[PDB]
Amino acid sequence: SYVLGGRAMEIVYDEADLRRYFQTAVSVSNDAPVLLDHFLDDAVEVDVDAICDGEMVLIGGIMEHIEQAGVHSGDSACSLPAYTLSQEIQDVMRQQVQKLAFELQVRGLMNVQFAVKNNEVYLIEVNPRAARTVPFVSKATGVPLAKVAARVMAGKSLAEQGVTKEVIPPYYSVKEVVLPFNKFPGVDPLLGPEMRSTGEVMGVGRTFAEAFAKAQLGSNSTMKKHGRALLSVREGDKERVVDLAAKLLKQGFELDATHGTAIVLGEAGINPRLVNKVHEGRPHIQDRIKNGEYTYIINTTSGRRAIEDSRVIRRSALQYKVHYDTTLNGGFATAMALNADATEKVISVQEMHAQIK
Amino acid sequence: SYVLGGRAMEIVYDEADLRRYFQTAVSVSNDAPVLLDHFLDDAVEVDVDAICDGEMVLIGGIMEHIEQAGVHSGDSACSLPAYTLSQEIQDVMRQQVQKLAFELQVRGLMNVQFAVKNNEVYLIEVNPRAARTVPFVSKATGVPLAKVAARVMAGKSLAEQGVTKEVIPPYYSVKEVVLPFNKFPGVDPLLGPEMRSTGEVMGVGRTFAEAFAKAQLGSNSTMKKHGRALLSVREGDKERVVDLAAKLLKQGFELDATHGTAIVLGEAGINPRLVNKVHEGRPHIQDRIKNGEYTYIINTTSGRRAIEDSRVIRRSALQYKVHYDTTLNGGFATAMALNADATEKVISVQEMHAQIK
Ligand SMILES: Nc1ncnc2c1ncn2[C@@H]1O[C@H](COP(=O)(O)OP(=O)(O)NP(=O)(O)O)[C@@H](O)[C@H]1O
Ligand SMILES: Nc1ncnc2c1ncn2[C@@H]1O[C@H](COP(=O)(O)OP(=O)(O)NP(=O)(O)O)[C@@H](O)[C@H]1O
Ligand SMILES: NCCC[C@H](N)C(=O)O
Ligand SMILES: NCCC[C@H](N)C(=O)O
Ligand SMILES: [Cl-]
Ligand SMILES: [K+]
Ligand SMILES: [K+]
Ligand SMILES: [Mn+2]
Ligand SMILES: [Mn+2]
Ligand SMILES: [Mn+2]
Ligand SMILES: [Mn+2]
Structure with a gap:
């Protein structure tokens, strides 16, 4: 608590x-x-920032996380507006929040966290205050959420403010985080339910892939648009890994897959190159990672031991400046963004806010 | 003894x-x-049938085995003439035979066995009598050795008979055996130092390849010219496997391999499709073999325990009627055969013999 x-x-x-x-x-x-x-499990995470004035409730922004529920919102990459979430489902969320605001006796800002599993909306929690998302939302929407809520707190209704309709922007705004793992080498650079990031970046694009690509690059990523990718996914992801591989291949990547993950690709028509774990042969991944053999690495894990058993790839990948994902959704976004050019077009906050009708 | x-x-x-x-x-x-x-280890096996009349030694034929020394001569396929052995080395053997014929006081037929390792002739044994290769060599050379040797035994010299020079036919002759493993299912259909075959067939060709293909077909082999091939080889065969895999690929086969084999092939640039051993997962080899996924199986082993480990591929391959090879040399030969048509051309023995000058 x-x-x-x-x-x-x-x-x-x-x-x-x-x-x-x-x-x-x-x-x-x-x-x-x-x-x-x-x-x-396999739940999509969602953040909602809103303002209630005891009269009404204003929806600030609906952000869909890239990383699944389980990875703290704080260490999650996120999209505004949602990039895969159904309108019908959002609408549901919009309602819940409202319900909450009022029931809660909310006055000013509030932030609600959900999870969408099998088209069902589950409630994670509610922060009866200004959340760390506000600035990102304000910036994306053009609506100075902190001001308004401040005004509200003071006595000036949303209505009196002339802020009553949720703003849906023309472009895509994506936030990505920066983690301090490189400062603390003895730490397993794995994500989770606890927040470890120090900062964030924002990417604005015509497309999700465009926003994503920018946020990623801005996050100081080392991701390349070519090379060899290593794919080592966990049981559950065994199904979608196939499609992600395909994208990578379509993109010109060459692939390697550790035992189990290869078995699956292959059974699907894709044959990666087999790679040996640390305890299997030589060379092994580590050697390979170390050799500046990979440009991308995708590695999902699941279970206290399986995690301490895969700690090496992560440490190495991190150690060798190799871009790596630990969530499949994360890998999908990374892949999607391959189809984008972060240096193609530049826009100003000013222009941005100007596009809002 | x-x-x-x-x-x-x-x-x-x-x-x-x-x-x-x-x-x-x-x-x-x-x-x-x-x-x-x-x-x-890694030695070629050779059989030599000769006649000694106490005056002279007549070389009936030098047969080079397909399977290496370690696989009983009676269970090996063989070629006449030799298909890989240097002349220099064969000549070394012809002399040893003569030296032996004379020292041992041979009078009539004899059969000599050698092993070639590192360009070095090794003596395995001498069979002071007519051997099982006699009929085949006779058929291949057009010389009725049993008749000739019978006469020598009864008093008539080679000179007198006018059978004094070794015959080297214009065509290739290949012998292949038939094994009874299908009558005794509870048996591991492995080859070895103890002979188990019940019969044999003869293949005659313009080339070694043509000879082999004919031998292989007459031996009632289920081999196909296309499909999916399973590769599961031992450590020593890890070098030549690539060449083999390659050759199958150039033929249009599709490959599958187990773990270790897949690793090596991967390193060569060959990316087989991964297949799970029986202890590894599902579907596995057994499942796939059983499903009719394969048209060829190449499986080599080494050591009591490693043999007993791979027994299931062999037993399943048999049960399901898939052509399988248990020696790399065996596989190489099969490969060659792929470039020939056993149904192409037929020739009577009268005609084969007539081609001999
Ligand atoms: N039941 C659940 N299933 C899956 N993931 C969950 C669940 N509950 C929480 N999480 C994840 O764990 C995170 C942390 O839970 P939470 O109670 O929101 O922590 P917090 O410290 O209050 N965060 P915040 O106030 O935003 O800084 C959430 O953001 C989810 O990603
Ligand atoms: N030292 C050795 N190294 C490798 N292989 C060998 C060796 N000795 C024998 N072999 C193998 O063992 C087989 C049988 O040995 P062998 O002495 O010829 O038995 P055999 O019963 O006398 N045969 P046979 O009279 O021809 O029916 C040979 O054909 C070789 O394949
Ligand atoms: N949004 C957190 C950063 C993602 C990181 N590259 C990883 O895949 O764990
Ligand atoms: N001439 C011996 C038969 C070979 C059999 N296909 C196997 O390789 O064991
Ligand atoms: Cl690049
Ligand atoms: K999340
Ligand atoms: K042999
Ligand atoms: Mn939270
Ligand atoms: Mn909280
Ligand atoms: Mn013998
Ligand atoms: Mn013998």
């Missing part, structure tokens, strides 16, 4: 994992209780 | 392998000793 940035938050998988991470949860908890939630 | 067909013969890998097969070896030895011979 009473924490932001998911402080002391951890995905428990069993008995043990609990005893281990419970005290801590409590220590930061604030004489408030520790919630034990059930983990929604 | 005193056995033919490799009765009770076995390749031993350690002490205990030894203690397990020793008594059996003795039991069949005829109050004669058991030889312990160091195994000759």
Whole structure:
């Protein structure tokens, strides 16, 4: 309870994992209780920032995360407006928030977090305050959300302000984060339910792929538009990995796939090059990563040990300035952006805000 | 001692392998000793049938085996003339035969066995009588050795008979064997030092390839000129496998391979399609073989345990009627055969013999 940035938050998988991470949860908890939630797999995460004045509720922005629920919103890349979420589903979300605002007695700013699994909208939480997304939203929308909510807090309704209709922008605005893993080498550069990033960037595009590509480049990525890609995905992702591989191939990448991931591609008509794990042969990935053999790496994991078992690729990839994704959705966006030219067109905030009708 | 067909013969890998097969070896030895011979790895096997009249030695034929030394002569396919052996080396063997014929006091037929390793002739054994290769060589050379040798035995010299020069036919002759593994399913259809074949066929061609293809077809092989091929080879064969894989590819085959093989092929630039062993996952080889996915199977093993590990490919390949090779040389030969038409041309023996000058 009473924490932001998911402080002391951890995905428990069993008995043990609990005893281990419970005290801590409590220590930061604030004489408030520790919630034990059930983990929604393959869920899309969503952030909603809104303003309620006791009369009305104004929808600031709906942001669809790239990375799935499980990866803190704070370490997630996000899109405004949504890039895959159905209108019907958004509308649902818009309603819930409203419901919440009022029930909550909200006055000023609020931020709501959801999860969309099998077309169902689940409630993650609500921050009865200004969230870290505001600036990004304000910038994307042209609507100085902090001002307004400030005004509201003071007595000047949204109506009196003349701010009542949710703004939907012409272009795509994508936020991407920057992680401090390079400062702390002894740390597993893996993402999760706890927030570890220090900053963020924003990409604006005609297309999601255009916005994404810009945010990525701005995030200081090392991603290349050619080369060899390494694909090492986890069981669940075994199905979509095939389509992502295809895109990479279409793009001119050559592929390598560790045992299990190759088995699947191949069974689908794609034959990657087999690569040996650390404990399998020589050369092994590490050698390969190290050799400046890859330009891209996609690696999904799942389970406390499987994670400590794959820690090496990540450390190496990070260590060798190789662009790497740890989420398949993340890989899909990375791929999509291959079809874009981050240095093609430049626009000003001014122009941006000018396109808004 | 005193056995033919490799009765009770076995390749031993350690002490205990030894203690397990020793008594059996003795039991069949005829109050004669058991030889312990160091195994000759990557060596070519050669058979030589000759007649000695105490005056002169007549070389009937030198047959080079397809399968290497270690696979019983009676279970190996063979070629007359030799198809890979240098003249220089064959000549070395012709002399050894003569030297032996004379020292041993041979009077009539004899059969000599050699192994070629590193351009070095090695003696395996001498069969002081007519051998199983006699009819084939006679048919191949047009010289009725049993008749000639019978006469020599009864008093008539080679000179007198006017059979004094070795015949080297204009065509290739290849012998192939038929194995009974299909009658005894609970058996691992592996080849070895002990003879298990029940019969043989003869293939005659303008080339080694033509000869082999004919031998292979008459041996009732299920081999196809297209399809998917399964490659699963041992460590030593890791070098020549590439060439083999390549050759299958140039022929239009589609490859599948297991882990290790796939690794090597990958390194060569060949990207087979990965296939799961039986302990690896699903579908696996067994499943795929069983499904009729394959038209050719090349599977080589090495060592008691590694043999017993791969037994299932062999047994399934058999049950499902897929052509399989258990030696790389075997595979290479098969490959060659791919470039020929066994149904193309036919020739009577009368006609073959007439082509001899
Ligand atoms: N039930 C759940 N299933 C899957 N993921 C979840 C679940 N609950 C939370 N998460 C993920 O874990 C993150 C952290 O949960 P949360 O309670 O929002 O932490 P927080 O510290 O309050 N964040 P914030 O106030 O925005 O700085 C969410 O952003 C989700 O990505
Ligand atoms: N040292 C060795 N290294 C490699 N292979 C060998 C060696 N000794 C024998 N072999 C193999 O073992 C087989 C059988 O040995 P061999 O002494 O010829 O048995 P055999 O019963 O007398 N045969 P046969 O009289 O021709 O029916 C040979 O054909 C070779 O394949
Ligand atoms: N949005 C967090 C950054 C993504 C990172 N490249 C990874 O795939 O983990
Ligand atoms: N001449 C021996 C038969 C070979 C069999 N196809 C296998 O390679 O074992
Ligand atoms: Cl580039
Ligand atoms: K997320
Ligand atoms: K042999
Ligand atoms: Mn919070
Ligand atoms: Mn949160
Ligand atoms: Mn013998
Ligand atoms: Mn022999």
